[PDB]
Design a protein around this ligand. Sequence first.
Ligand SMILES: [K+]
Ligand SMILES: [K+]
Ligand SMILES: [K+]
Ligand SMILES: [K+]
Ligand SMILES: [K+]
Ligand SMILES: [K+]
Ligand SMILES: [K+]
Ligand SMILES: [K+]
Ligand SMILES: [K+]
Ligand SMILES: [K+]
Ligand SMILES: [K+]
Lengths: 183, 184, 187, 187, 185, 183, 184, 184, 183, 183, 183
Amino acid sequence: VPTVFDIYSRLLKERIVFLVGPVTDESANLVVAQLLFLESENPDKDIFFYINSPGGSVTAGMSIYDTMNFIKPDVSTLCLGQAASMGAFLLSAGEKGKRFALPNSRIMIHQPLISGGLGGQASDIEIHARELLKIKEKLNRLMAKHCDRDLADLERDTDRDNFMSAEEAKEYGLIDQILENRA
Amino acid sequence: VPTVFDIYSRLLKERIVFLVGPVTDESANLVVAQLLFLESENPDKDIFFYINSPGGSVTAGMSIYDTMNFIKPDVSTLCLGQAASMGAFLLSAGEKGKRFALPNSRIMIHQPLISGGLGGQASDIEIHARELLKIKEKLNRLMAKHCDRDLADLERDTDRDNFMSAEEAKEYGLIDQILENRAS
Amino acid sequence: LVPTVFDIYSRLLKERIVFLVGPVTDESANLVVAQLLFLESENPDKDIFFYINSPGGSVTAGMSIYDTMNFIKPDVSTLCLGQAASMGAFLLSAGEKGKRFALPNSRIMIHQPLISGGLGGQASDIEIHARELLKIKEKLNRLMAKHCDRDLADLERDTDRDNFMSAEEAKEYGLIDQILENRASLR
Amino acid sequence: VPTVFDIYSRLLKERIVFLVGPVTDESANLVVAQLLFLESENPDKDIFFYINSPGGSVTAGMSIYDTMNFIKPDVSTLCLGQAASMGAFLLSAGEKGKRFALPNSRIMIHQPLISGGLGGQASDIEIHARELLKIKEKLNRLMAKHCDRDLADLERDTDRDNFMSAEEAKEYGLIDQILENRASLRL
Amino acid sequence: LVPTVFDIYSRLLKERIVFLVGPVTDESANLVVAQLLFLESENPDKDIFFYINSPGGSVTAGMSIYDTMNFIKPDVSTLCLGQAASMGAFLLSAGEKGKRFALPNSRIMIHQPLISGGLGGQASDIEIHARELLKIKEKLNRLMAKHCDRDLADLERDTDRDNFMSAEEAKEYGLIDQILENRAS
Amino acid sequence: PTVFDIYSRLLKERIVFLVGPVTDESANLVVAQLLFLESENPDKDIFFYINSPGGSVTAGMSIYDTMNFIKPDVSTLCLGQAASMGAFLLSAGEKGKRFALPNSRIMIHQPLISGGLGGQASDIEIHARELLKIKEKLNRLMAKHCDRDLADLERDTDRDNFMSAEEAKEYGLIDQILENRAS
Amino acid sequence: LVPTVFDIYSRLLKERIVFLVGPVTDESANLVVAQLLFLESENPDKDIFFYINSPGGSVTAGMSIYDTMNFIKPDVSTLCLGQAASMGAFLLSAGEKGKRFALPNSRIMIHQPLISGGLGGQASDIEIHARELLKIKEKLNRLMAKHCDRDLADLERDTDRDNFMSAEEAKEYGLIDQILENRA
Amino acid sequence: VPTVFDIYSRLLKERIVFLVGPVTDESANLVVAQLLFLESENPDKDIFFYINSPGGSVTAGMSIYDTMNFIKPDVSTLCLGQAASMGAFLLSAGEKGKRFALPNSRIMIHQPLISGGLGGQASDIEIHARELLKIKEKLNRLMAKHCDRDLADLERDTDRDNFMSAEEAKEYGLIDQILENRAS
Amino acid sequence: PTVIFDIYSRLLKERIVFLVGPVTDESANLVVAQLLFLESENPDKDIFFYINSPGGSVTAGMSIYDTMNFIKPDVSTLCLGQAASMGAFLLSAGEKGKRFALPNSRIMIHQPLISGGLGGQASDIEIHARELLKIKEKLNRLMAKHCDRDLADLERDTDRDNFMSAEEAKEYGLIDQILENRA
Amino acid sequence: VPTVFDIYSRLLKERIVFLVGPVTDESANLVVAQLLFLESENPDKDIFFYINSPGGSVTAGMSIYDTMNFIKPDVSTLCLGQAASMGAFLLSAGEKGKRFALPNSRIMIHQPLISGGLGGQASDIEIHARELLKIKEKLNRLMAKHCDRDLADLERDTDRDNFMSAEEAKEYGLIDQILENRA
Amino acid sequence: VPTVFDIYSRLLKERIVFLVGPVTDESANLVVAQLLFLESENPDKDIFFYINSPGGSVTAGMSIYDTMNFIKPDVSTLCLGQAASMGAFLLSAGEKGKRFALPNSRIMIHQPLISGGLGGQASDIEIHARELLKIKEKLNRLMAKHCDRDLADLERDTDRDNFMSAEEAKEYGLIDQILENRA
Ligand SMILES: [K+]
Ligand SMILES: [K+]
Ligand SMILES: [K+]
Ligand SMILES: [K+]
Ligand SMILES: [K+]
Ligand SMILES: [K+]
Ligand SMILES: [K+]
Ligand SMILES: [K+]
Ligand SMILES: [K+]
Ligand SMILES: [K+]
Ligand SMILES: [K+]
């Protein structure tokens, strides 16, 4: 990572925060720390949250989400490359009016998926299956609010992988505008 | 597996069938085949099903269970060593009055357990969780019938691993008699 | 590991019992095919009893059994013990209508095709296999609707995700004809 | 990790301490180190302990817990993402009145679970089993005190995994308030 | 693991049934050859029934079967059950003209050669093997065109990528002669 | 070799071997032979040769209960070693007919779990209680075999307790040491 | 591992040189994105020089670079050294027209998408991803024809299998503008 | 690790030294180094040795032990989380009157345990077994001294894993006081 | 190969029994089984025990040794290739006057060797160390009897690996005669 | 890393650049970066390119090659240890008159060889085989120019591994001089 | 490693050098470097060599040894934890009068043992065996000198692992004093 301060610290001075690659507890909390830092520095200026991510941990994603809503500054979001699953959730969670994507950005939404497995007694599996259903509806309810859409639409549209171009994500109500250039 | 015909084939002549170790499709179906053969040889004579098993695949176990109930001969069961989970299920499914255990046998019952995992979309996990709940109730319903007990008792008593001595397994209704030796 | 009585399975073959146990593979499928052809050669006039306890497996391997069941003269009667899932359920439902059975606690499950591993190569190649996979899905829903005397749309709906059935539900759906409880019956 | 002091060293100036991911000897003692440092800097000002953790080592968690109660400053806790198991324990252990959660936080409590193994003579397994029961009761007693509930309630409610929304954790007595934004602080 | 009646496969061999099942290797191919030679020896005039359920495999192993089929006096009739892909499809189409069949739900697939992991060595060595692979590719397209009574240009066009065919499509192409639903055609 | 193989031939002389770790398969093979020999002649003695370090408790119990269940006297002979469940089965031979060759090694001890107990504390409690029941059951049965007190067995099996053939005789685990057919 | 003079790459960054070397990954691509945004912030009026030696990589990762190249005000001039293949060649061809270069012995290669690993799931899921892969394939061909000022049909033809081009062929093809032999 | 001078070094200014995790040659010698350093900076002020450790190498633990006793300053000990095996030995080795534990600390003592195996000729195994007995006796004698207890008690009480709460450890004589807060 | 019987079955007719390679429970009990069977065939005729072995499990070896002394037939031993450790023990255990070696045989004796290792509690290590020394002493005592030498001779000569030619072995008391051919 | 600035950074002040070990994209680009840097510092002073390398990626090598020819300063090359394949190519690409080797340096040239394989359809394999032949011709053509030798000679002399002493490399036209010391 | 300067650099200011863990080429040469550095800093002041080591490479150990004797400053040694094999050799090599141990130190001496194995032609095995015997003899000669004891005594006392307490080591002549505290 080049020095100019390193490049990401330098862009952090312009209130740029990056989310890149898989969302983990660590990648997410680093984002949380930067958001808290920028608010501390100036609680009134917008923050620009750049997202290129296939998603990842739900709880990790929520920590970012709740922080975006908790802090005073508006968090504007920009998708480059892709925003899939939790990536798309966060992209859409940006301050309404300030959710953007670059022209060839890819957005994808879907229902939760467990990689690996559920292992234990039937009683335990029942408890975790019920929790997974609450997570699924919870995510559909929040996502519908972000998109100003009916919940029933989100349930229908996330049953399987739903790929959207930037215009489709805009029309869906997931982002507000496509930016081609600063004009 | 020493010759005398191997030892197990020789014992098959005496209408003895063994279930030893994990219940798998292959081990279960080998039992089914032996049950059908003995019925073919003589549909009226009792079959002696010796069980020493920690259990295994539920559907593999059901194939034995359904074959035991379908064939004409009485299937007598004997627990030696242990009968746990599907093993105990099969032990308890032997012809009423003809379910036995040796004095130091271990019986154990419990609710279904998935080793490994449920992996995929939530929709699939919901489907498979519901199927699992169905299996759990079905097994409790069938087990309560075998033991001549309340459904609620089996539900209570299989929530966690429940180990029973031969005498406790008798008291519960899981077997009919403890055999110390051929003398009664 | 197999008792001699002939080995036990060769012995039951004398009674025209044929087993399909575990994953359906080329080798396991062709072994079934061979037993079908053998029993036909021995006596084309007698029924064959095809016992199925299987989670399925290879679709083409399964097809080789299916077409063989339809090709030979003897009625191939099917019986589910333990389970018949996917290609296993397909074969069960493909038994001579009127002679498709299940034991009471059998589990049947049907669903659309699923690929193990993956498709890797150029987009062109992937397009082709995807297009092919879609045909398989369609063909199987068609054949399955015929087996069940059900409308195609019903099968499409009911196979989108894993669909577990008890023997009675499988009977109601039209996959089997009878549930067998015990031997005490028709001589 | 971005520099501004690195970002975490920077937030430490504001008496923010993070617990992120599994609780290990090393991750827990780093928390311990920071708590003692903040106390040294100013023994009278509140410390803000932000927790996003699935839990981990009980003895590692206990080192943090005992340090939280030991130092002069109030340790305020905030759950973001999740607080499960020992994570949930530590969240509930914050100074009463200053335990918070973000709205979509996930909280979970349960009895101790150990795997890997218990290996040895029966005598050794007996000693460790009795100790495990001792640990189980201790944690339930401490948790009941944190939640202002009867011990019997905690025993019932941790027998299997018990997931709580932020609101439920509040009703339970595990946290005091749910914060949506900086205008949310009440009581 | 194989029932006794002789074993099941030996029993079917008395009826001149020969199986090719699964991947074509030197050992699986030579077993077919041994059986072909044996059945010729038992009776050089009666047809042989070659059942193919195969995804293909080794080209040289497949060729040993092919040359043997053409070398012996008896007609070799072929039947696809399940699938005949790649070299499997080649052998299916190589059956005696008029005697090539498929069951209704059989799958046929043809394509150009695909090479083992990789080829490794000096550029000179690589050139020699690439030339050979090109000679192999054309050779197979030509023989296949003959089997199907088709133009070489068509086989070249139709095998550039994986080409899946139903039994009827394989019939229309000229790869097999008839589809057998049951013992009646 | 192939004399029939050698073990089948000796089975005709009513010799049954237990060699190596006691597993479900090895134990049940022993059980089948016992039942076979009883079926051939329920009244003549069976000779059970044991060279074993022990193994599965439940597998061992299937042998033990079969030995007591069948009509024939089961005579036991230790060669090489009989440890743990191996020693248990040895001591279980028909009283008066339990033997060891002179340089046999006998060892007794309390149960030990290899690998681990893994799960919830409730489950671990359940299995710890079961293992303790096994420990006591085996000490009582061993006390009966040896005509010794339960308290002695508890004391003498706390750790690995190695015994010579003479020590094993004095303890009451075997009846006689055989050096050759005379004696 | 990296000489200091500030490290060597930070040093060349002062001359507005940004490197893309090796596989294009999310992290390697976004580091480029960071450097583009930084240089713009330092001087929105001066050219940026993007040196590419890459076999390609993630399509989405590449687009993030691509869209950022087009979004920022400074002209992003591109230079191929060693090679630019697949997404590497795409990015090379995306440089500001008139300022796309290659060194004389550079290798360019273009082709249709290739799938890493495999497709795993239900036929429904497989259909969705194949339809998506086909969209990407057409999208890339359309953009590439535009970069090269060529007909859409030409790129479709010329990318069906691996297509190697020398510097001159890439120039003739319209992928680059000039070949640089010597600084003088 | 947080900078403030990094956090652990910062606490070193307050004469706080940590032992965390398994005792190894490297982790033990780092503690020895800090102890020697603190003595050199000020030989007259107490050192605070915070212990959260399951134990580890005996000789490594002994290098820490002998250094605690060698240096002029009092080494006060505090258990947080746990002190087991060599960890408990070191905890109990703090200057008498200055050994503490936090309330929910877990303390455990036992006899030596060998990892891996003893392998070689019987002559060599004899030598190493004799050495292990001296090690065992030596540690029980040193522990009996630390705890103001009879040697006979330590031998009996370390035969198998012996778990203690902080209060039980105070009562046993392993530590002097339990600290709940800065007031205790 | 088969001969009219596998080749080893055929030689059993000659009353030839082989021990070849490492002595394990399974290999040792297969020898035991052959000895017992040859005794039942004819308790009066000599058995010829051919040993080519590096040794192995002490208990497994002792099962062979005790069986050799137990059965009625004389057991002649012949070393071909090598007889080392328990191999050498069994060789020197042949009926006195009837222990042989071929001319280029390698014989080696030493003290017990544990490859692997004592792990666990110091109490347990002490028990097993005590046991090892007993085994060490008993083997030296028995070997001294075999060789018609005193215990101290054997202690000294087994402290480390001690290789012997056939002739040295004879001089030592370990075998009776070297056989060049069938003279 | 010995510090003085690490040692290599310090030598970069002397306009010394090293190529050591396998030529990879990263190691080659590091060289490219250093060449561009030195040119920026002083476009008129010679650069000294020290090579100890068995070769590696051809496209990686070409990026160095083209950079050496593109920049204004003369790039002098020195072989120490060895220069084989792409290493030898780069050594011979130094400014004519300024290509050197130390007395016991090893040079080796050869035709391209593929590590791993050509795997895919025959169509894809034909494409890549043709390209390999183009690479082979281009490298022989460039090498003949560097060496001032006939194309037919390089084709001949690289059919198999061709090892050269420093003197042989000089005679061949691959380098200009052998340096024993600064005199 | 904490900062104060890392902790070990800080103690170097007090002329403390550590040998901790296995002696390797790298760990030994780091000791050599510090010994040379402390000597250059002040050739007249004592150096304090703290040893906690189980030994290791013989040639690596010798590099420390010869350096200790080569440099002008006295190298005082202190054992903490353990000094075994080469560790004990180096401890015993401290300036006479200045070799110390902490009270619960463990000292161990023994003859050379080979890591891995000796593998190759018989000729090569002979060469390396001869070499190992010279090393064994030299190590015993030097150790005899350090300890002011007869060579024959060291030969006897190193034949197998020889464990010593601090007092036994003082008595043996391996160290000069036991330090309980700075008194
Ligand atoms: K906000
Ligand atoms: K029945
Ligand atoms: K039919
Ligand atoms: K506090
Ligand atoms: K022919
Ligand atoms: K009996
Ligand atoms: K631009
Ligand atoms: K002190
Ligand atoms: K004898
Ligand atoms: K130049
Ligand atoms: K000196």
